[PDB]
From a paper:
Here we show that catalytic activation occurs in two ATP-dependent stages driven by two helicases: PRP2 and Aquarius. Here the inactivation of Aquarius leads to the stalling of a spliceosome intermediate—the BAQR complex—found halfway through the catalytic activation process. The cryogenic electron microscopy structure of BAQR reveals how PRP2 and Aquarius remodel Bact and BAQR, respectively.
The cryo-EM density map of human BAQR enabled the building of the PRP2core and of the accessory N-terminal domain (PRP2NTD, residues 265–295). The PRP2core from BAQR is in the open, post-ATP hydrolytic conformation. Instead, PRP2 has now moved around 85 Å deep towards the branch helix and the core of BAQR, filling a large cavity between SF3B1 and PRP8 within BAQR. In this post-translocation state, PRP2 accommodated seven nucleotides of the intron, assigned as the 7–13 region downstream of BS-A, in a channel framed by the RecA-like domains on one side and PRP2CTD on the other side. Because the pocket is also a hinge, SF3B1 opens widely to unclamp the branch duplex from one side, like an opening pair of tweezers. Indeed, flexible elements of PRP2NTD, PPIL4 and SKIP form a stable 3D assembly that bound the exiting RNA strand at the nucleotides 17–20, downstream of the BS-A. Notably, the residues 371–400 binds PRP2core, such that a 310 helix intercalates like a wedge between the two RecA modules and the HB domain of PRP2.
Residue numbers in the entry:
A (entry chain P): 9 to 108
B (entry chain N): 759 to 953, 958 to 1019
C (entry chain C): 490 to 1304
D (entry chain B): 10 to 16, 18 to 80
E (entry chain E): 458 to 601, 604 to 621, 629 to 656, 682 to 689
F (entry chain D): 3 to 91
G (entry chain I): 53 to 73, 77 to 87
H (entry chain G): 160 to 190
Write the structure that this text describes.
Amino acid sequence: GVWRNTEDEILKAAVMKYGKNQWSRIASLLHRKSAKQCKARWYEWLDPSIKKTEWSREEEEKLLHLAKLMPTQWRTIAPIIGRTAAQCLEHYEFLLDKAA
Amino acid sequence: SLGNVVLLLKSLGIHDLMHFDFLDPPPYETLLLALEQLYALGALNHLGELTTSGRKMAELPVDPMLSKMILASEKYSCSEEILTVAAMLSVNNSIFYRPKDKVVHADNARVNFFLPGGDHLVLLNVYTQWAESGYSSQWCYENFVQFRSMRRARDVREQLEGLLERVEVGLSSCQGDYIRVRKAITAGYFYHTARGYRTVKQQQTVFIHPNSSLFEQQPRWLLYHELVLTTKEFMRQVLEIESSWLLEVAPHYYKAK
Amino acid sequence: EEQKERKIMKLLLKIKNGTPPMRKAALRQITDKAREFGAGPLFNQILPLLMSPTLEDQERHLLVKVIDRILYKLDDLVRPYVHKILVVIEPLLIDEDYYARVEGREIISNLAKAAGLATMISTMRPDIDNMDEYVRNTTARAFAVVASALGIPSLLPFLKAVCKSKKSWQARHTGIKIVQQIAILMGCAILPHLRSLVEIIEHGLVDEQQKVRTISALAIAALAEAATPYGIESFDSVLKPLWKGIRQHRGKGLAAFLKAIGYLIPLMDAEYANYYTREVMLILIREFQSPDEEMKKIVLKVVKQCCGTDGVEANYIKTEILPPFFKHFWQHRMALDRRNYRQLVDTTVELANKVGAAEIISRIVDDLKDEAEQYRKMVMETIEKIMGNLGAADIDHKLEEQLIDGILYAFQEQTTEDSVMLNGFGTVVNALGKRVKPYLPQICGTVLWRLNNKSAKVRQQAADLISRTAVVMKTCQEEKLMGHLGVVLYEYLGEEYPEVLGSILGALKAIVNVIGMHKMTPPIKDLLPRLTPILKNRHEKVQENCIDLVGRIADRGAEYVSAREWMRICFELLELLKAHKKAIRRATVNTFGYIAKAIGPHDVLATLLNNLKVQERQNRVCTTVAIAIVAETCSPFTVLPALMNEYRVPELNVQNGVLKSLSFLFEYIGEMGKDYIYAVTPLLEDALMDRDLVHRQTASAVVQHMSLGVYGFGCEDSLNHLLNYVWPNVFETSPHVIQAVMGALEGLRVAIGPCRMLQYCLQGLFHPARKVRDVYWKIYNSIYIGSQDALIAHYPRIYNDDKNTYIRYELDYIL
Amino acid sequence: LEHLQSKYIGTGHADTTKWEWLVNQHRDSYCSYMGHFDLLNYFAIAENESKARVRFNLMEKMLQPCGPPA
Amino acid sequence: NRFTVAELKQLVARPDVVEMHDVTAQDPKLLVHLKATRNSVPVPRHWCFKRKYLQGKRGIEKPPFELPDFIKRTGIQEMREALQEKEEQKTMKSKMREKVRPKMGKIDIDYQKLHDAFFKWQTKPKLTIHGDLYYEGKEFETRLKKPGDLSDELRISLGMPVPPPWLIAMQRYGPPPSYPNLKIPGLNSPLYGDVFGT
Amino acid sequence: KHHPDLIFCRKQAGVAIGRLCEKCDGKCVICDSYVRPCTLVRICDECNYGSYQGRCVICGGPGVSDAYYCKECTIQEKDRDGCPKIVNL
Amino acid sequence: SYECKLCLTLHNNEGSYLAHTKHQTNLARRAA
Amino acid sequence: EAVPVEAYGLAMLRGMGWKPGEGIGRTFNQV
RNA sequence: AUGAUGUCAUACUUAUCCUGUCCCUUUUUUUUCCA
Ligand SMILES: [Zn+2]
Ligand SMILES: [Zn+2]
Ligand SMILES: [Zn+2]
Ligand SMILES: [Zn+2]
């Protein structure tokens, strides 16, 4: 399940060549990788619409508020605040460790 | 080998060990290696005479190569931990239960006690977790430990705790310094070393036992306790060292890496 | 005293810690002062060192060297120290290890050559009459070593006085043990003293004690074995009572007397041997019923010695010894033992060689029908050894029918993998030859019945029996039965079990090898298309047998198959090249050579070049081996333009394949490469200038094989031109390329000559750099090891200097 | 490498002396002149000496090659 | 402990054979005596370089290969490149289709042409001297083109028949100071082909 | 096809005859080739004597065929170098 | 083989050069 | 500590004697 | 301007090789407590 940077560059080139909805055509290039793994790797880490910035005050307030409202439903919470589920879960854990 | 009882015969004033009366004489090479070991241990003088440290060696009745734990205690503190280590090394029957069938539960119960730095710390962990548990038979049954051989280890530890004023060693502990525990073990174990898939002294090839905690993850320097040959030249009760404090103890025996 | 002892431990630490030149200098200084130091402190420092268990093999060898040098420098100086050296060396003389007993014998020889025999004799005289048998045996071994070192007449009157002494029978027993062990240590050296030792031991041979007479018979047997074949009459004084004593002794003494009789029998006169055989044959007929294992082993050894004894007739043995021997020694209890079965088999083979194998074969034919597997295996092994030793000329017709029925029942009950029984079956029917023709349809019907069995092992064994018996089926030229067997095996070719399919393929390969292509039913044009999908199998045995059959067909009968099918075979062989066993790949390369010899070397070369440029895996060196085999079998002028043009491909791996194929090609062709050295010279010159070390290493292998190939043909100019590129590459640090450089330098020194290598190394042997002069000294040391004789004439002309004269005046002499 | 390869006649090392190499070359030249019949005949019949006298002179000159070491 | 380069130059008959670091050797006189013989070779230059031998190029391009004349006269390169270009346009469906259904008779020229090119048309190539040592260059300074002689391209470009226009000024100006040992034939040393001097 | 370890004997050869197993049959004992088996293999000493009777002069299997030197090793006459039986040290 | 002339670095694979995009600092050093 | 303090007992045993019961190895009917 | 340095991956070489390992018995001291 590891991802080398060579495979990330090949995946980026394959997405820029073959579009989005083709994944088995993309996974034909990558040795020992599946199309589901390529789709998850694109939508989790390598998508350019992922906000790779720092959290604002408004983002942290909305994250703490929505984590108080809907507990442990991060796939619902994450499109509201614009981050992904892993980043917002990790930042919520970091904020609870900072509050403790 | 007669390494336990050469010290017993020397503690009773007999000096003519090679000319002592017997039904049949023991071989002179066994007595030579026993006297060479007791020269390497801190009990014999330049004239082959017992010291007062040799009287401390011969007070408590376990093997001298094990009894250098006690004289290594208070030099690296941590006396109670190596006391319980010597209690599990003083047993007769084998520890841990490996039944016909089951296997996987018993192997997982063995792996759950594993610690880095040999199986002496594993046996110390077994006595530590048996403590604060009511000394129950149900804990030993649930962890695949024989409740016949480790009660004997408890009695040996109790007897050796009672025989601590005669050696005048206090109840010392470190609570975390297992490097000090392994250093005290290495102070007790300098003769029993081998590295290079080969003995460092006798130049005999070695093979790791599968029941040891370090069967995989082959070490850089290691000591042991026993050298039983059954099929391959095996490796019983290994322990991790670095050969850095190996030169700190027994400098006459150890030179040139 | 104290300073001498301090110097003794100084020499000890210099020997055991210093260099072996410094150890040799310390040993020379110790031996120079051995009379000065004395044997006292030398013994007091050596015998604790000899008794030390921590000494290594080199340490004890150096200890034996120091003891031998000190003994040679001391001689009689260790005369008070004989007893201490003896009690140290007496466990060393009873050593179980061979090297330790050899070192103890060397120490005993040094003690006998240094001190004297009289001091050791007076030392061992109270130890001769020791009550314990172990101390008496140690004393016997030490005195035998002393008698072997000092010679037989030095203590032979002393040993006669000990054995003639009636003080104690244990000392006489020890003396006879001394005589027996000295005879065992000597062997042929006791030949002039055989009559003297026989006269010494003739008093002990008639002793009333059981153990003394037993060891006297053992010493007489040892003297008969050691002095073979001289001194037959010298033991003749023991020939009269011992033959009476075999009629008198019982138990272990009877066995010792029988062993002495069996050792004394093959040297006597023929009438005397016949009379002794007729005398001891009644005792042997009594002793066949003896249940003791060592007594039965001694009886079997005596029977083998009597059968090996000439002049014991033929009909007398077959009428006297053989029926109770077959009644007693041939049972399941005899076959249940391990060493006794082998001894009985060797004795049976020796007796069948002595008195004809037909009687033993007729008397042991029913035991192949026995229910016991190990007994039937032993009988089949003895029958196979007797048939391989003598033959099948004396076999009767009903005897031959009984043998065929016995081996058919033996093959019919084969629970284990008795492959030696299969080899025995092949040996018996190949020894029969043309006489098995009436029995052939019964054998064929039984094998074809067992081929329909449920078990795969039965079908595998039946096909193995076909593969064993195909040659003898084709000796009689009964081609209808063999063709019918080939048709049935062609039907059986669609089996799914791999071991069975490999056995069927091996049987078909045997049938094709013993019939030939023209009378082969089914024909090759129907056989090879059936064999084509079997090459896609992944099992190793199927691949090995099928590739062997395809190679036999392509070497022998390739005219029946069109070239399209051969190209399909080649395309399958490319996938077959990725196997694991090296024999499969070697036979694959041989099939590639056979197909290229059959149909032409062009399209198969293009196929191999595409495979070489296409593989990029842990294979394709075998592709280069196949390319070299194709070129060597098909006139390498036809192959070298395409191989040279394949070097222009920039695909980073095909060029190394081209160079490796060139190296393998030159190693295959040898002395025929001189037409192509000038062709491959600029390719190797361009390859040696490459950045990559792989090209330089493989080109170095090319230079090595090309230099070793056409040595002695005047192509040294191109070899020197290639050496002008190879010799800059000697500074490489990788081990493979520097091994290729060393091999290329060795090949260039063989081919061009040591003069140019000496010219290359003379300006760099005295280089200021340590590593450069070290590498140049390694190359010069290899050249001097290879060319020690020829380097004198190729030595440089250097004039005489102030250190010594250098210009030899013998070379300036003109006659 | 090998121990006998370094222990062979004419062998050397990176710290081999020039006088030792010259003495080994002279000893090898004397041994080659003694072994070869044609070289001994060319170096013997040129002067007025016997063949065995030339062999004894070469045997003396073999020890003379170790005559002045440094 | 060791003398300077002047003592080694005075002691040896060849001061040009003395190296810069030969004085620190244990036997500098023996090394100078061995280096002054006619059939010696120098140390390769990689012993002083930190760079490995023929390793630090890393950025240049080279021609692939130059075949000899008889191999190109057989003409294997033409249909070999045609077969490679035909196989490059093929698909793997067509590749296994050709694998199960082969097509031979591709080149199929003869055996006699290669037999003649191996034997009748066999030409001895150019081999260098015994003392030659290849190095990182040794492929560019091919003039060893004599000095004092103009090249054929410069003679054709300046209209020099085989009388250059600057040869009169070269004769009137004497020998050049850059190469005083160079002798120009025809005007200073009274020259075959383009090499009209030495 | 070699390894940097496994020096063989470097002993003086004798009258004992080398012997090869089928797993490494046909190989040269020195350079591991398969071309021109010319010179027979002599195995010096107690490599033959004792329990190692008729064994492999290579890996250690039960030997079936006579070992040989190739012609290329005997071009420089490496066959007189000594015993080629592998001793694992 | 793939070579970066701005970095003067050889690459075994295509993704080795595809990950060679340090190269900015080497390009700034080789710019002058 | 030193070497010959382990060798004086072996020297005294060498000067005293040796018994066959000490280090007894069983071997008979050898070839 | 190319030297050292790191288990990071990718190429490459040796006609490298498809592979093995869990103890019979058993023995060794001494000293206090509540109406
Ligand atoms: Zn083998
Ligand atoms: Zn070879
Ligand atoms: Zn050998
Ligand atoms: Zn770059």
